[PDB]
Amino acid sequence: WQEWERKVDFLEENITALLEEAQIQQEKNMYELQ
């Protein structure tokens, strides 16, 4: 459970950052489709 906790915490921090980039890239797709 000790290892589990730091793995889920990182995975959470990871996906959050990834979710930002995913949005930013999305912001560029329609910003640049034309």
């Binding site: 459970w1 906790e5 889920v8 959470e12 996906i15 959050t16 979710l19 995913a22 949005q23 999305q26 797709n29 329609m30 489709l33």
Partner: protein, 36 residues
Amino acid sequence: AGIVQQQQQLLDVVKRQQELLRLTVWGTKNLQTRVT
């Protein structure tokens, strides 16, 4: 456009799924604390 749109809708689901996942990890943590 219609797909760059479907791209957003997909991003929205995962965004929402993460919101739900967070709460679920919070529940697991809470129960783990009391259960032990």
